[PDB]
Symmetry: C4
């Protein structure tokens, strides 16, 4: 039989203290990936595990040519450990999976089908009010991806999308709004069996309007400027009408003293985002690699 | 029968939902470019259209070696879609053209002729007291050619030399080249003959903030000297006229007001710093037809 | 017998006016490094010395193949000259020491042993007395340490490598350990505050939320609680005016403190001027 | 004879409306450079001239293999036009001179001599003993604490714009945007081997550049004022927390004498905080801006950058 040096699919699994599930995960994944008759690879990212998960990963690495390990220097975030695996993931399609396996792995057979039709990004949302009517008109046409009962963390992305978001710091939080900005051909498939809180979803909306727009800063600059010209001109005219004494002296100082703190709020928020954009510090660090080559030190 | 590999002219056309005008656009442009006896290319930028404009593009691409398609991932806007096409245009001269042919394509013959005389940028300009005031404020900085400003003139129909495209290639302001960047790059400029001042002076403020630090510096010193006049007014005059409310409110209103536009000029420049340091690209290319991906 | 191309250990010594200690430093260093039977190199960084330190360095350079000199243009400081020496230092392990030998060179034999076991970073912290790791208050871990090649490469482009003991050692992770050896509380939390602002961004966000929610309590109380109760035509006026201008006028200064603090760090991150400048090199090549 | 391929000296001249002085400039410079018996080059930067200076430069370029022209797209500052010429200048030493010839060119023989002695930067400051006053002694005593023994290169009646710089110095500051104001403080930060040569042939801007220096090479104005503004904030918050927690009473203490002063003091310290914050924010924009420092329209006898 012949050989093929091109990888078509890459599954990335971040692991933190997953000593138990390695045998069942690899057996289930093999029973799902083998019938496809397509070359693949398994990127296992050890995220500073303490329960000897790495020792078991290396054992599966020795007896499986598809197992590749990315050992981080310490425990990072789950999203950061996922970004590290995607960086070391070669292949035309990338799909992340969880270790606890809340979603059936057999569903990848349906995701790759939509990818073969031409779709660059294919989500896997489960099937299960005024907010949904809102985001459909502004945020994204496919609001069912980020509905309360399911997050679009189970998805397939083409190589063009992974390459497009390689340098973006928002690739860590790709489901926070970056998916609606990158565009491309998107679709989803349906299936059945913390998060899910509406406070945590409007938190993603607030985190989205500040990250992909300058409106909160610009509309407050113009608003603060027009109330400033009203303040200075009315003070010059008041110093040459009605002088309500305390009914204005307290109102004015406590109004201006309060509006400056929220102005300093949006300034401090955007200043923190500008800092996070200019840091030379990477998202993660790789301690060891098994079955992979290091990324170029240019970065 | 000499095969020339160098592209002499580049026509860049951003298109969003121009399914109807494709037949007349490519045909009427051909009768203008053929008598020039000059190698050229047409860079057609698909800006996320839904009305199957891309399918009609690919059909024209299949039977025309000068048609090259740049398929964007989504709708990004006219200025960004134009910037994407200029990036993939490797010709000695670049000319952006609208698909609805608001300007006659025959002016290309006039644009290239003035370009061969040595001019690096050649424009194509059409022909109350606000018209006398606005035109007078701009000749002090714009220079010899200001007619590209005065309404309804827009310089979006122009010819730019390769040196000019390369000079503004990495600048984020290349999307709004007609917002002030044309007057900063300088070069040898000229034009050929053939609104809303609320938006015209909007670009004046957007230019003073983009190419200068004067509003921030001037207000920094202006707010600093009134801070010294402040602290000194309560430094020596506390060891001991007191209009009471006539100044307690005014000072509260005055000192609180000069800070609000101090945070305004700071908040404006801070947003510009974000737009300069953000890692998010200007656009994303979904597919390419007849072109290679960048960087080459 | 046979030549060896790869250097295994690198000793980095920042030097400022060390004309006298050179004879004893190089002799005692050779006494410690020779029994290791391991190829090494000594990177000597001249940090703008005013005495005859450089002349003695060149003399030792001429008769010793392991002495290499990095001459800085001017005096940049102990930390910057240390970063400059690590940049021009190749080898699997890097160990910085001082010219005045409060750091006994014999501990290198123990530092390399812990590194042989798999530890990527091995500290040489002094014993405390008085009254993992976390020895950063009593005498505390200093610039006496061993770092694997993977660790020095990971923080090569980071500006925080100058102050690696200010918090970067806790962020990089890796396998870490320390070794104890013998022979102010204000700087403790001065460096602790210097760490919570560089690797966290929480002091800015927490004060952003706090300053904004007290702005809502402020604005809501004066906009239409006072206007709604005096539209019919109060709390002690002077006491309320005084407590309002000083509470609001002072909390804004803390917001300006954290904003100015982070703005200065953004300037230090985007400035194009380098950290140091090399005037001459002896036994080394220029970078990049 | 034989041919040498390395350039030993580079003379950079920014030119703006120098049509008349070109004939006297190139001839007098050639009479100074020939006896040195070392290879050299003359980089002429056309800085958006409005007359026929460029046409005359091209004529000198056609008959002189040492004349090279850098034509900028438009008129920039003299600092920018000089930085553009240094970028296209290849050579072991670089010397910038003015076109109107305000300083004698014969000093090059002394600059190269000091350069061959080992000095990386050699200045040529004028010798003026006039204007000795107490203010000059104050400025000299305050600037000597940071600049060093070489600080004499900036008395009020002279600057250090006539200098020789080694290739290592021009390379060290090639990517720095502050190279246009190299004589505004950057010369003292590079710290290379420096000396000057003497020859005899406003205080507003001096301390203005010093104020620009403490902001350009330091963070003290921002750090000191944030610390100061914070400790007076602690005094303001605490003292007001006890003025509201003093329930042992119920109209005013000092009424207008203190309260009007209070809004004034807290309102003024914030304006200085906004002053230093806005000042450093503008410098951050100048460091992160993608807009280049200059643009080159044409080149004669040179290659475009990068190589
Ligand atoms: O610090 C962490 C935490 C999480 N994980 C990985 O992320 C998944 C988190 O699973 P969990 O059920 O807690 O999150 P959820 O299923 O709700 O998305 C696990 O498979 C871990 O392998 C990780 O690598 N590092
Ligand atoms: O979102 C858009 C809108 C405009 N266009 C193109 O930009 C040009 C603008 O022409 P239009 O007549 O629509 O605008 P106007 O003439 O008013 O300037 C047209 O060729 C469009 O194809 C585009 O690429 N994306
Ligand atoms: O400005 C300086 C001061 C320190 N050093 C070097 O750093 C080490 C620290 O020595 P020092 O005794 O001054 O530091 P301390 O003992 O107080 O920790 C010495 O080898 C010096 O040569 C230096 O290169 N430049
Ligand atoms: O806008 C300018 C002004 C100055 N110069 C050049 O800089 C030098 C300084 O000229 P000027 O005599 O006007 O300045 P000053 O002699 O007073 O220092 C001259 O050789 C000019 O060619 C320039 O290139 N562009
Ligand atoms: Mg789980
Ligand atoms: Mg139109
Ligand atoms: Mg010491
Ligand atoms: Mg002059």
């Amino acid at each position: 039989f012949q050989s093929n040096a091109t990888i078509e699919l890459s599954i990335v699994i971040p692991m933190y203290n997953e000593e138990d599930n390695l045998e069942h995960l690899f057996a289930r994944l093999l029973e799902v990936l083998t019938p496809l008759k397509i070359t693949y690879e398994i990127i296992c990212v050890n995220d500073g595990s303490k329960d000897k998960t790495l020792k078991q990963l290396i054992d599966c690495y020795q007896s499986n040519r598809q197992i590749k390990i990315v050992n981080l220097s310490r425990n990072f975030g789950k999203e950061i450990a996922l970004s590290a695996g995607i960086d070391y993931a070669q292949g035309n399609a990338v799909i992340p999976i969880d270790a606890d396996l809340q979603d059936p792995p057999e569903l990848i057979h349906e995701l790759v089908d939509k990818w073969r039709e031409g779709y660059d990004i294919v989500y896997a949302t489960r099937r299960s009010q005024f907010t949904a009517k809102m985001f459909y008109k502004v945020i994204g046409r496919m609001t069912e991806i980020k509905i309360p009962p399911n997050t679009g963390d189970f998805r397939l992305m083409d190589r063009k999308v992974v390459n497009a978001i390689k340098q973006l710091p928002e690739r860590t939080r790709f489901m926070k709004g970056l998916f609606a900005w990158v565009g491309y051909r998107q679709t989803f498939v349906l299936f059945d069996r913390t998060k899910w809180n509406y406070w945590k979803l409007w938190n993603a909306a607030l985190d989205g309007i500040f990250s992909f727009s300058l409106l909160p800063l610009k509309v407050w600059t113009y608003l603060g400027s027009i109330i400033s010209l009203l303040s200075l001109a009315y003070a010059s005219f008041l110093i040459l009408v009605d002088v309500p004494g305390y009914a204005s002296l307290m109102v004015a100082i406590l109004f201006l003293g309060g509006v400056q703190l929220i102005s300093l709020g949006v300034i401090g928020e955007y200043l923190g985002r500008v800092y996070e954009e200019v840091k030379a510090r990477p998202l993660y660090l790789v301690s060891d690699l098994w079955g992979l080559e290091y990324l170029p030190l240019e970065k």
